[PDB]
Design a protein around this ligand. Sequence first.
Ligand code: CLA
Ligand code: CLA
Ligand code: CLA
Ligand code: CLA
Ligand code: BCR
Ligand code: BCR
Ligand code: BCR
Ligand code: LMT
Ligand code: LMT
Ligand code: CA
Ligand code: CL
Ligand code: CL
Lengths: 341, 450, 78, 334, 34, 35, 135
Amino acid sequence: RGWFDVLDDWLKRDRFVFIGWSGLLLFPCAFMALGGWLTGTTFVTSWYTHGLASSYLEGANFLTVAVSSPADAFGHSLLFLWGPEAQGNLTRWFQIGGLWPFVALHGAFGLIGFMLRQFEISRLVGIRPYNAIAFSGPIAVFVSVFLMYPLGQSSWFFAPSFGVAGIFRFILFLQGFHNWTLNPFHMMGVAGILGGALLCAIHGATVENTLFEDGEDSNTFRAFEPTQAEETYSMVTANRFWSQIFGIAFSNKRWLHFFMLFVPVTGLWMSSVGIVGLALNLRAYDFVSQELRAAEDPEFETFYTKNILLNEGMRAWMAPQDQPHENFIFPEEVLPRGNAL
Amino acid sequence: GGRDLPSTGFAWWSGNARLINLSGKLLGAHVAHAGLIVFWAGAMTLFEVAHFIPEKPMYEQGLILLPHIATLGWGVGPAGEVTDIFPFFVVGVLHLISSAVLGLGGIYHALRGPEVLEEYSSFFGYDWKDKNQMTNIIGYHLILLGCGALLLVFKAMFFGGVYDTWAPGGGDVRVITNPTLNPAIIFGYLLKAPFGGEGWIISVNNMEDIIGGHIWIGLICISGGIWHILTKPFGWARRALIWSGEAYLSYSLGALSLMGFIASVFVWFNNTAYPSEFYGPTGMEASQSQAFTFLVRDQRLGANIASAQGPTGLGKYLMRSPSGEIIFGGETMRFWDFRGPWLEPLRGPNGLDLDKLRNDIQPWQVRRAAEYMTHAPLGSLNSVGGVITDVNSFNYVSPRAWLATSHFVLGFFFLVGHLWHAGRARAAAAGFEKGIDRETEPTLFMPDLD
Amino acid sequence: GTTGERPFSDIVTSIRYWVIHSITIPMLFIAGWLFVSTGLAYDAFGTPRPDEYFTQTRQELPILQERYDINQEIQEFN
Amino acid sequence: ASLWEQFCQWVTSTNNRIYVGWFGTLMIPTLLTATTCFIIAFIAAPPVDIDGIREPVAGSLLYGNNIISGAVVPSSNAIGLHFYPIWEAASLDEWLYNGGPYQLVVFHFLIGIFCYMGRQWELSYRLGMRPWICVAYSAPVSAATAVFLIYPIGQGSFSDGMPLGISGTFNFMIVFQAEHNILMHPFHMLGVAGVFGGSLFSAMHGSLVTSSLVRETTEVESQNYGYKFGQEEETYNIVAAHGYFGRLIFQYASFNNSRSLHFFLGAWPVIGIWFTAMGVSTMAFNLNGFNFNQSILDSQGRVIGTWADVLNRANIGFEVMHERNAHNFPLDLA
Amino acid sequence: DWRVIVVVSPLLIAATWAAINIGAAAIRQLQDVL
Amino acid sequence: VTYPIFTVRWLAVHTLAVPSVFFVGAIAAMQFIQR
Amino acid sequence: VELTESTRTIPLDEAGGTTTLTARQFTNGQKIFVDTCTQCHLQGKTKTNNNVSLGLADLAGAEPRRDNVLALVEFLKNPKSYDGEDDYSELHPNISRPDIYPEMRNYTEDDIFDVAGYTLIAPKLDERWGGTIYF
Ligand code: CLA
Ligand code: CLA
Ligand code: CLA
Ligand code: CLA
Ligand SMILES: CC1=C(/C=C/C(C)=C/C=C/C(C)=C/C=C/C=C(C)/C=C/C=C(C)/C=C/C2=C(C)CCCC2(C)C)C(C)(C)CCC1
Ligand SMILES: CC1=C(/C=C/C(C)=C/C=C/C(C)=C/C=C/C=C(C)/C=C/C=C(C)/C=C/C2=C(C)CCCC2(C)C)C(C)(C)CCC1
Ligand SMILES: CC1=C(/C=C/C(C)=C/C=C/C(C)=C/C=C/C=C(C)/C=C/C=C(C)/C=C/C2=C(C)CCCC2(C)C)C(C)(C)CCC1
Ligand SMILES: CCCCCCCCCCCCO[C@@H]1O[C@H](CO)[C@@H](O[C@H]2O[C@H](CO)[C@@H](O)[C@H](O)[C@H]2O)[C@H](O)[C@H]1O
Ligand SMILES: CCCCCCCCCCCCO[C@@H]1O[C@H](CO)[C@@H](O[C@H]2O[C@H](CO)[C@@H](O)[C@H](O)[C@H]2O)[C@H](O)[C@H]1O
Ligand SMILES: [Ca+2]
Ligand SMILES: [Cl-]
Ligand SMILES: [Cl-]
């Protein structure tokens, strides 16, 4: 037995936490990313990068702590602890936002490790690897949003911060500056996510309400056995119900479950494509025909133009605080605003 | 009865379903739960009394029970000034002690009392299918409910009265000597559209109507109680309804959902049964108050507020409702159906009256409008008052907001519970609540759809 | 169905686990406590104390602007 | 036997291609009315003075909108919460100008969807099923009711109902965030958990079932043909799926009971959507999301910013621009 | 720094407690696995 | 019966729980910081 | 920085007078402000009439100037119009009218002094103090 086979045997032992070869990448990187996030949200400020308190130590709460993006001055520097910025100084590395690339890169490699784990375990137990394929969607989201978007922009500063309110800020930023809601790729993402939730709810309810009477208890949960060969709910009854209620119904179980995979995954992939577009400011910001008409016709008003006005307001009022490195000085009189407000 | 899954068919997380046919244990559960309700009433009242600063308004201090006592005319005087703090304390103490008694009884019946009551007594023993006995329990409780309504009437008429925010000379506790028993008014309330300007029963705006409607409710409830004690359900009711414990529960759940929604709307809009003295302004009231406050200020500055047109061309301060009435301008145009004791003195037959606006505005109305405008029912979940973009220094959320939100949520979830139990009761009565029988799966005997 | 390891319920219901952990768990708790309450965390992570966000000479946000010499920048920020 | 009995057997018949039922006797007319009015208005409705300031907003395709920007515009702020049926307008043109189509479509739609939920219960009863699919459907119904009825009621005007359009929906959301900070409301966070988790569980369940499909086809044909409609046997190996998943995370986090698994699949998104519907319904009464503006002060007393303050800046930017001509007085109370 | 000493000492004490209460069986297991 | 004490599961448990309790102690202490 | 003595040092009267609040005086002034003034004075504004704010410029523009503690206490006893011509004791809360402003009847002269001092100190801690309603 060669040493490689012996190692392979040890890594793939049946234990409470499977390790595998993929574990060598997953567990250290995932632990680094998680511990980095926890450390930053507990102890680390964003005073020098954003002028914000972002840790429990500073008095922030769960909703307002974040591992904030690094200072815009560094561009897309990877900000290694040993890099030319921190130069091995851990305190300075924390202060310049070095924890953000730490978490982002370790999380990217952890995600790779987790999907490799899906592949490895699928191969070991002898099933098709569709779980890894489904997980490609979250990977596309993470790559586009946390890497490609800031890479197309001026710096990592404009990446989403790892935090609840940081993410909320990123969301509102994308609305105001990119008109992200108007983006058809985002609308396909929304369709996929809401459709996935709908499919989850409707399938769970349909199964639970077409169950066969296989026990005597009012508690129907123990009238199932994992090794039983027969279906536990009536597909025929479900199909008739949905055909008469909704007009159409699934008749193929396999197609049903592939659809439940397909819808949210495609939603994630389409939204990731849209985010890639936004990385280069290739926005679906305006409808030029309506802009031109409004510019020449002061009685043409649509919900689109109203939303454009909202975006202008958000940008002007938010930019000085959101982008402190720019030293934006917008005097009170240049701020757009409606009457009396 | 059994107390586990094998002997009952119900898991622990549905353990109360094991009580459906154990009438004594079920009675214990109900009595103990009633003890919980009364305990909360007493303890919350004592908490609110302890945390009460009696020279600050009730609505500024997160109080929801003390306003209920004040509205009933206890411990308050003109404009809602808290005269005596002792009656609030007494209400709380009495509820706490009685909750002790109720909890003792509920524990006795739930833990040691007879499991079922039917072989103990015919009077208290019941069967869900025993239609006559169920209508007997309905009758007893209807008599009690009518009696409670008459208790409200007696308090308003013979025991010091209730707080009347519409009283001349200022809102005050007054005795209602002439309740309107006229069934035209009382039951025409029930026929008013549930839309803006009509406000189906939320629009009741004088304590005479409230007390008279409660006299009618008391009589209706007592007579219906007798009617149900002395009869059994008719054939049509028997053929239309499911007759089971869970079915009766579902019926009550639907009723409760309806009442929860109604109460949320009632506290949001009505300022008669919920005087703004104790509950703060309604949102409509606060919006109208802001419009009034700036009409007054700008008029003092010299603005001719009758002829001042705003940027859009509509009157800045005054305008017409779609039916022509003179109303406050601005966004508060939507709130022109608002009526309040501080604003009606400036209202003429056509709406807001220019002569009264120009020379009849009193300093107390200005103060009241400023207070109501600054206590608009807007606030954050962590109790930061004002619009959501305001900063953290104003700790206020309107009691109306708390009550309306809570009771809309409870109404919704009780509609959900009604759907759950109604569907389950139907399925169980028809016998497929445990799933489809493989042998006699109904869809297998049906023609194909196409 | 056990992969070999001792069941958690058995371990955490045993006396020896609790003899060990009624000491170990509180010690880490108060170690983190002392980490915060001695001021070690402030100095280790560079997080400002409540009185060091601004200095008597810097009333503005100490936003980093220089690409490579951040140590000197932070020192001049104080 | 009798004419009425025959009609009853027809309406409650399980052999109709589309089940009608007694709830259907209300659903079908109201839903058809709402659909026809919606289509007509979306194509050809004239501009609507939503804000009650004589500032009509063009919602229909024929007045310059595309599919994205088109909408059925909520009724005028001047109407408020008043009932505005066609017969209370002096003319059809007045009814159109004041946004009557919105009220017609919305009221009929709401009645229709409640009757749809009742009809789901009804058909489940006629087929001998368990009755709780309608309970799951009550979540989207609750959300729709919150945005079309409850929020306008609390705010006091159907002009503050969600517009029936894509861009109108976005406008609704942006203004809602500006006024209520819905992102910082825990019920909306629970809704986000509901939909993110529902999509997550949909992807996992579909992928685990697809991964464990029993071999019944060749590599040429679709694996879907391995399942025959109405077959008694199971089409995938749930034990293999459990082995895979319980090794992916750990054994005791994996369902091996299909019934518990499917109950979880039903319950998670439904509960999340109930919570977010209640969030909107309670923000209708201006009980808003968390406000941490200036929660962190330094020792001297100067405010230290957090991400919540940046969020508040964005909210203010939205707030000061929205309905730019509608406000006369400093506080947006209505 | 004394702060380091007082932040470390609890961790060390937990280590020795666990050692003195588990060490016999731990060394047993270590020897058994060679 | 007579299982090993230390395992991969033991390490996985502690790698999380130990810093978790440390951090919780830190945050608890933060609850008492005054500006 | 700390909440230093200089930060707490505020003009005492119009003749160049100067007083320093203690930390406790400042904290009680803040507490009273939050309890009874933030109602229509959130962030130094005036919700019911923002032509007359609590900003230092508005305070100093009043007749007489109210940017010193004695003038503030005097206004809180006998409120007047911004040009000091109209008596606002019916319209602004004051300790002189406990019959219509009971929210104020429990306050001492020390309490009014503290809230006036806080009104003078808060502007130098917040650049948004006394600004536009949405600002
Ligand atoms: C008076 C009202 C009422 C009554 C008497 C019942 C009675 C019953 N219900 Mg029911 N239900 C109700 C209202 C009611 N329900 C409402 C409003 C809903 C909608 C949510 C439901 C939904 C429901 C379901 C889905 C089921 C029942 C079931 C049952 C039966 C057993 C339940 C049990 O053992 O409790 C057990 C109690 C628990 C498991 C604890 C639950 C805790 C809840 C979920 C959270 C509490 C939140 C609360 C606001 C406090 C917040 C705490 C916060 C501080 C963290 C029983 C006869 C079961 C049944 O059908 O039996 C045949 C069952 O499956 N009900
Ligand atoms: C209002 C809430 C409420 C009430 C009144 C009841 C009542 C009851 N439940 Mg129940 N239950 C509830 C909520 C409630 N439940 C919830 C939330 C769950 C989910 C966890 C359950 C799950 C459940 C199951 C699985 C079962 C019950 C059962 C029962 C019945 C038997 C009680 C028993 O023997 O247990 C005994 C418990 C004790 C002896 C412990 C002490 C209990 C006392 C009352 C504590 C009182 C303390 C109080 C402060 C002292 C004051 C005393 C006095 C001075 C005032 C009983 C009538 C059983 C049943 O159906 O019987 C057939 C049953 O099997 N329940
Ligand atoms: C609705 C609540 C309710 C109901 C339906 C019952 C029903 C029952 N109880 Mg119970 N009980 C309750 C609450 C309730 N109890 C409470 C709160 C306590 C704590 C004090 C008790 C303590 C208790 C004990 C110790 C016993 C019972 C017993 C019984 C059974 C026999 C009743 C009987 O004939 O005695 C006679 C009834 C009367 C003489 C009528 C007296 C009516 C009351 C006491 C006077 C006040 C009337 C009032 C004005 C009406 C409105 C009440 C007000 C609060 C609004 C019976 C099934 C007995 C039993 O189970 O037999 C083995 C038993 O030993 N109960
Ligand atoms: C909580 C109190 C209560 C409860 C639970 C009951 C319960 C019952 N009563 Mg009743 N009743 C009551 C109070 C109560 N009653 C009072 C106070 C009176 C005196 C006025 C009566 C007088 C009375 C009579 C004369 C009869 C009953 C009957 C019945 C039985 C069947 C009736 C039915 O199906 O209901 C539901 C009602 C219907 C199915 C009819 C449809 C009504 C309309 C179309 C519904 C529209 C409602 C609308 C949406 C709500 C808007 C509110 C408002 C604007 C109208 C049933 C067990 C019947 C019986 O069998 O007697 C033994 C019967 O003949 N009761
Ligand atoms: C940073 C860094 C690093 C790393 C580190 C690490 C990796 C660590 C860690 C760490 C960790 C790992 C920590 C932790 C933690 C934790 C916490 C802080 C917790 C918590 C919690 C809570 C709060 C919970 C709660 C709850 C709920 C809510 C539900 C139910 C109940 C309970 C209680 C459970 C190093 C040095 C390498 C390098 C440099 C950088
Ligand atoms: C059945 C059951 C249950 C339930 C139970 C219940 C529900 C109960 C209750 C109960 C109750 C409901 C109770 C009570 C009580 C009360 C008391 C015990 C009292 C008292 C008193 C006092 C002592 C007072 C005092 C005072 C005064 C006199 C005045 C001043 C203030 C004070 C407070 C000091 C459960 C779920 C658990 C489970 C098991 C079974
Ligand atoms: C006190 C008061 C008043 C009075 C009130 C009254 C006098 C009332 C009433 C009321 C009433 C007297 C009511 C009621 C109700 C009813 C209901 C709620 C119903 C129903 C129904 C149902 C539930 C049905 C169902 C069904 C159907 C649909 C068909 C088939 C069969 C069945 C059964 C399923 C006034 C406002 C003046 C003033 C203020 C206070
Ligand atoms: C899977 C791979 C994971 C890669 C990451 C794993 C952790 C890697 C950490 C590497 C850290 C590099 O840390 C770096 O160490 C060197 C060597 O001591 C230090 O260098 C220091 O000592 C050396 C000699 O002793 C001097 O010449 C130098 O001037 C001084 O700075 C750097 O100041 C520090 O930045
Ligand atoms: C849970 C883990 C928590 C993270 C760690 C918490 C402790 C933080 C460590 C701060 C220690 C002292 O922090 C300070 O900055 C770094 C630490 O690398 C050292 O920095 C020095 O060494 C490095 C490494 O060769 C070189 O770049 C150079 O010689 C100099 O910068 C300083 O001499 C020290 O004074
Ligand atoms: Ca006040
Ligand atoms: Cl807008
Ligand atoms: Cl306005």
